[PDB]
Structure formats: C-alpha cells, structure tokens
Design an enzyme around this catalytic site. Structure first.
Site, short mmCIF file in Angstrom:
data_model
loop_
_atom_site.label_atom_id
_atom_site.label_comp_id
_atom_site.label_asym_id
_atom_site.label_seq_id
_atom_site.Cartn_x
_atom_site.Cartn_y
_atom_site.Cartn_z
N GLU A 164 -19.47 -2.70 -40.32
CA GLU A 164 -20.07 -1.46 -40.78
C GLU A 164 -21.37 -1.57 -41.58
OE1 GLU A 164 -18.91 1.26 -40.03
OE2 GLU A 164 -16.84 0.92 -39.31
N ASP A 216 -24.50 7.71 -38.91
CA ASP A 216 -23.82 6.68 -38.17
C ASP A 216 -24.24 6.69 -36.68
OD1 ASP A 216 -22.16 8.46 -36.77
OD2 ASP A 216 -20.37 8.00 -38.00
N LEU A 224 -17.43 7.81 -43.81
CA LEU A 224 -17.90 9.04 -43.23
C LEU A 224 -17.92 10.19 -44.20
CD1 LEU A 224 -18.79 11.01 -41.31
CD2 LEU A 224 -16.49 11.20 -40.43
N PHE A 259 -9.75 2.30 -39.07
CA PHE A 259 -10.84 2.62 -39.99
C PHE A 259 -11.98 3.34 -39.26
CE2 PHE A 259 -13.09 1.56 -44.05
CZ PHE A 259 -14.43 1.77 -43.71
N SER A 277 -2.52 0.58 -24.39
CA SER A 277 -2.99 -0.63 -25.05
C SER A 277 -2.00 -0.99 -26.14
CB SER A 277 -4.27 -0.33 -25.82
OG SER A 277 -5.26 0.23 -24.96
N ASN A 331 -7.51 -3.32 -20.93
CA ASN A 331 -7.24 -1.89 -21.12
C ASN A 331 -8.08 -1.28 -22.24
OD1 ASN A 331 -5.45 0.57 -22.37
ND2 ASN A 331 -5.09 0.38 -20.18
#
Ligand SMILES: [Cl-]
Ligand SMILES: [Cl-]
EC number: 3.2.1.17
Length: 162
Positions: A11, A20, A32, A104, A117, A132
């Site tokens: 990040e 972002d 965020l 996250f 998945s 996948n």
C-alpha cells in the site's frame, strides 16, 4: 516478514490525502477515507478519524495508528465472518497473512464472495486456487500486487516479497 511489513510494501505510505487506484480518497497506509468524489467529504472523514483538524495532512505516527486499527479490524472481521473464519483456521501462518491482505484491500464482503477460491484454499489445492484467484477484476486491475498475494497463497513462503 509479517502482515504489517507485507501490507506496508503493498500500500505504501502517504501523508497527504491521495487518490487510490480506483480513484478514491485515501490517506497513510491504504486507509480508505471515502468513496465520494468530494475532497471535502474526505477532509471531514479524515478529521473525524484523527480527532483533530488536519487540513488533509497527518504525521507518520497518526498513519501508523490508522494502520494498526485497520489490520486489527481486518483480522477481527475474518474471525467473525462465517465464510472466512474456517478458511483462516485451516491455513498456516504465511497464507493467513495472505487472506488478511486480501481482506484489507477488498473488504470482508468481497472476499467472502470468492466462493470457489476459498474452497480450494481450504482443501489445500494451492495451484488450483492460484489459477482461480487470477480470474478476477482484482487481478486484472492490480496485477502486480495480486501476483504477489497469489504467490503467497501458492507457496506458503514470503518469496514474492525478499
Ligand atoms: Cl477510523
Ligand atoms: Cl499492482
């Protein structure tokens, strides 16, 4: 390597509000702030987050405090989630970090939707699960980061990240 160093590499750190990859107002270590287009809606959410008038700018300590709360909520969220918890419980320490990372970034709700998945991770079918995972908006939008997380799930090591 651990969850904090992994997400800090993914990040970055920014002390000024920024947008972002999706175009959302963010601050610090991937925190965020709002999905609304207004820069003022973002400065208001910031000040409410920090408890002080910040003028869109925070200190490294403040960034790190948001980050700490965000990893914590990410983990707690997984454990409260009926769909996520069992997968988490079933994995080893590195791959647990990978799930956290995915949570996250895209939130509990999204991740929870990766039905196939998750079942594959649970059964320990690493190669299949990696294939996948790649068939997703996620991978197509942020391919390098996605490849790192995916390799983490595939391998169970931190190789994608030294
Ligand atoms: Cl907050
Ligand atoms: Cl990327």
């Amino acid at each position: 390597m651990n969850i904090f160093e992994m997400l800090r590499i993914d990040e970055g750190l920014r002390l000024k509000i920024y947008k972002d990859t999706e175009g959302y107002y963010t601050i610090g270590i991937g925190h965020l702030l709002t999905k609304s287009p207004s820069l003022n809606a973002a400065k208001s959410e910031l000040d409410k987050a920090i408890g002080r008038n910040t003028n869109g700018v925070i200190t490294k300590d403040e960034a790190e405090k948001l980050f700490n709360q965000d990893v914590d909520a990410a983990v707690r969220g997984i454990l409260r989630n009926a769909k996520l918890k069992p997968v988490y419980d079933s994995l080893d320490a590195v791959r647990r970090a990978a799930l956290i990372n995915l949570v996250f970034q895209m939130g509990e709700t999204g991740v929870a939707g990766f039905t196939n998945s998750l079942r594959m991770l649970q059964q320990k079918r690493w190669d299949e699960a990696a294939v996948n995972l790649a068939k997703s908006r996620w991978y197509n939008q942020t391919p390098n980061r996605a490849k790192r997380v995916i390799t983490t799930f595939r391998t169970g090591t931190w190789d994608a990240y030294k």
